[PDB]
């Protein structure tokens, strides 16, 4: 139903600057209240700023002098400007309308912000081939694995989304190197094994980059 | 800016009961709190404000109450779905803020995982380093025990596991645990095995293979 | 209804709140002085 | 802003004639139009001071000639270094602006292609994506026509091509075509083919294989 596009998020070196944004599908962000908040894992959720429908602004101490919040009529999107940011701040940034009293009703999916020195790098990724013995029966599970790539995280998908049952994903997990690892595994009926190739799509926006790799039978006595 | 507390630390209940969550403050709200719904990987979803308002799309399931910074929230007739972390939210001043958060899970019956193992593939060798991963998937709880044996040496410091997030439908946890070697100590070192020890089994299982096998 | 507001809202005191909600009332007093004769003035100067 | 338009489309001609290339502005100006010439993925070079005044190190075959808003530009005795594309700029004000470009065609003979068709590599079924390749080489008119048929189907709208520009020593070109679709949808139909319509033929030929034959 309602529905808001977010937009912009990746990686930013200190002392640095960035605008995100967030797009509304068919409410006005000229009419209403809007807001931002800041959510980290292990660190908790936080509430940032807000414009209220006069077009007032108002915000938390946290990040004053360092943060500004716009709205765009002439596109009908919320923006969002970022300076000299710090470590702490690393986190995943939310929109989302309030109204009053400040129910937040309706979210977007949120998109993370990343802040490092370090450079992008760009993910590898190992396909698993499915063992002959996980054929002996209903069902067979199949995977692969991307690691070596900087920062989180890594949207994975299989045959474009085409199946929706049976695909289990794992966290990432951090490198002693600094960048992170993960992995897949989908869940499939065992007659089209040998007959239906599954190929896994990955996507890693920070570093907008892309790598298909299949998944075969093959054989494994060997 | 004003604190609230939440308890408990950890909710765990079966299908079917009745849920109660409680949220405590450091000054008064005059009954304007609210609670929020967040399922991992997914956006919060309003539930309910003040002491008693529902929201327009939640069921008659959910119900909270409260007064003079005491405020309890109850839930009965649990669904597999309503596992989720729980949020309460700050209306007493400017700025605002909300509480750490609460975790619920659900309790349906215990079941033994399936257990894989799978070797360092050719691009990892070439290169340079190689790593092994045994995978533990559709079990319960989440305390799984697992180890590694290599060459019949128990190497406890040079492996790093990875765990799963709980699929509402089955109720069932999964677990990844990683092996990583260098090539040499790869090359040096044949035989591998994992010894893994669950509540859903009725004895410890242990599976192994030997670098030989390619 | 749903993106129909009703543009009020009410206050809802309750008594045994803490002080910080607590309803109060507020007197606001304005002076203005155009190129019109003042009608007030101070009553305090009166001696036998 | 004053836009101009290069006329015609395109120029085929045989060496040793005379080229005629026509412009015209939006706005009537008094020779305040030059031209720009290029051999496609090099330097472009200036042509020609004003309406007719020539630069020292162009020969005598050019002659440009203006107008009020019609200008054409003229070479004779057509020469196989002559082989490029051709544009106007402005040297008047607006600020200065240029043209949409001419391309110029030196022609000998007619040549009809050679067609080849190639099956797709083990790597490309490897990976769930199939294509078909089929290639035109050493043709005039550049305009070769080419087109796809599966199972004697046609199919020519599931490609994307590119043609080289003309090979100085053989007077022809060559072209690049795809025929690409999922592997089910490749194994959907059985045998692929290709259509080719030229005029140096006294009519379309066409290569075919099975699925079956690798």
């Known amino acids: 139903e309602v529905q808001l596009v977010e937009s912009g998020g990746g990686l930013v070196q200190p002392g640095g600057s960035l605008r995100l944004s967030c797009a509304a599908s068919?409410?006005?962000?000229?009419?209403?209240?809007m807001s931002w908040v800041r959510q980290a894992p292990g660190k908790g959720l936080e509430w940032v700023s807000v414009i209220y429908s006069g077009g007032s602004t108002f915000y938390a101490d946290s990040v004053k002098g360092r943060f500004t919040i716009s709205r765009d009529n002439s596109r009908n999107t919320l923006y969002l400007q970022m300076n000299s940011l710090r470590a702490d701040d690393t986190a995943v940034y939310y929109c989302?309308?309030?109204?009053?009293?400040?129910?937040?009703?309706?979210w977007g999916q949120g998109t993370l912000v990343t802040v490092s020195s370090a450079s992008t790098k760009g993910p590898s990724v190992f396909p698993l081939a499915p063992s002959s013995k996980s054929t002996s029966g209903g069902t067979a599970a199949l995977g692969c694995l991307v690691k070596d790539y900087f920062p989180e995280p890594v949207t994975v998908s299989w045959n474009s989304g085409a199946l929706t049952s049976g695909v289990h994903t794992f966290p990432a997990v951090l490198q002693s190197s600094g960048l992170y690892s993960l992995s897949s595994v989908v869940t499939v009926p065992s007659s089209s094994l040998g007959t239906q190739t599954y190929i896994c799509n990955v996507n890693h926006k920070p570093s907008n980059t892309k790598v298909d790799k299949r998944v075969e039978p093959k054989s494994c006595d060997k | 800016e004003i604190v609230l507390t939440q308890s408990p630390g950890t909710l765990s209940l079966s299908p079917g009961e009745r849920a109660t969550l409680s949220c405590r403050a450091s000054q008064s709200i005059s009954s304007y709190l609210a609670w929020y719904q967040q399922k991992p990987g997914q956006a919060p979803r309003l539930l309910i404000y003040?002491?008693?308002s529902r929201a327009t799309g939640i069921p008659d399931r959910f119900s909270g109450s409260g007064s003079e910074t005491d405020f309890t929230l109850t839930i009965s007739r649990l669904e597999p779905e309503d596992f989720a972390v729980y949020f309460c939210?700050?209306?007493?001043?400017?700025?605002?803020?909300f509480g750490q958060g609460t975790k619920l899970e659900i309790k349906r019956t215990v079941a033994a995982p399936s257990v894989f193992i799978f070797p360092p593939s050719d691009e990892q060798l070439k290169s340079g380093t190689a790593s092994v991963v045994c995978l533990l998937n559709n079990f319960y709880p989440r305390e799984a025990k697992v180890q590694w044996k290599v060459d019949n040496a128990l190497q406890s410091g040079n492996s790093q596991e990875s765990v799963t997030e709980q699929d509402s439908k089955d109720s069932t946890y999964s677990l990844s645990s990683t092996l990583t070697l260098s090539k040499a100590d790869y090359e040096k070192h044949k035989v591998y095995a994992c010894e893994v020890t669950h509540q859903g089994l009725s004895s410890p299982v242990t599976k192994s293979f030997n670098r030989g096998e390619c | 209804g749903f993106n129909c507001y009703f543009p009020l809202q009410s206050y809802g005191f309750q008594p045994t709140n803490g002080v910080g909600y607590q309803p109060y009332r507020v007197v606001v007093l304005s002076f203005e002085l155009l190129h019109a004769p003042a009608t007030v003035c101070g009553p305090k100067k009166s001696t036998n | 802003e004053i836009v101009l338009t290069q006329s015609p489309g395109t120029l085929s001609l045989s060496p040793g004639e005379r080229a005629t290339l026509s412009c015209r502005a939006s706005q009537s100006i008094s020779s305040y139009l030059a031209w720009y010439q290029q051999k496609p993925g090099q330097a472009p070079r200036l042509?020609?001071?004003?309406?007719?005044?020539?630069?020292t190190g162009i020969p005598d075959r050019f002659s440009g000639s203006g107008s009020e808003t019609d200008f054409t530009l003229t070479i004779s005795r057509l020469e196989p270094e002559d082989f490029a594309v051709?544009?106007?700029?402005?040297?008047?004000?607006?600020?200065?602006?240029?043209?949409?470009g001419t391309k110029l065609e030196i022609k000998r003979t007619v040549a009809a292609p050679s067609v080849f068709i190639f099956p797709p590599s083990d790597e490309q079924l490897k990976s769930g994506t199939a294509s078909v390749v089929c290639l035109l080489n050493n043709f005039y008119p550049r305009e070769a026509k080419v087109q796809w048929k599966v199972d004697n189907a046609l199919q020519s709208g599931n490609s994307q091509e590119s043609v080289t520009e003309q090979d100085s020593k053989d007077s022809t070109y060559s072209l690049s075509s795809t025929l690409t679709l999922s592997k089910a949808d490749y194994e959907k139909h059985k045998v692929y083919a290709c259509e080719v319509t030229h005029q140096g033929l006294s009519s379309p030929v066409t290569k075919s294989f099975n699925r079956g034959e690798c």
């Open positions: 939210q700050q209306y007493g001043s400017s700025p605002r803020t």
């Open positions: 989302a309308r309030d109204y009053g009293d400040f129910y937040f009703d309706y």
């Open positions: 068919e409410i006005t962000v000229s009419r209403n209240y």
């Open positions: 003040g002491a008693s």
